[PDB]
Design a protein around this nucleic acid. Structure first.
Length: 63
DNA sequence: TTGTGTTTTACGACCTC
DNA sequence: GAGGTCGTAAAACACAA
């Protein structure tokens, strides 16, 4: 768990994550571990962010 | 500045596998 | 039991009023 109470991710951190997301919708356990390490976040955070991004996409698509 | 509507992290519940 | 969606909180944001 990750607590007090949410962090803002840097413009760079977001950029990499968007790029990776365009590379593939679902991140591999390997990739997850690369990305976390290069971006200065946790594996869990990277997991979660990818889950939120997919929900955002579903939400934009419904609209 | 603050009211407000939208986005962004992060969770817990339940589901699938 | 790892991850998944999905509904939700609250903090951060945009920015017109």
């Amino acid at each position: 768990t990750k607590d007090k109470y949410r962090v803002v991710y840097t413009d760079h951190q977001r950029l990499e994550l968007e790029k990776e997301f365009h590379y593939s919708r679902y991140i591999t356990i390997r990739r997850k571990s690369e990305l976390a390490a290069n971006l200065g976040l946790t594996e869990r955070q990277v997991k979660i962010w990818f889950q939120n991004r997919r929900a955002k996409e579903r939400k934009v698509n419904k609209k």
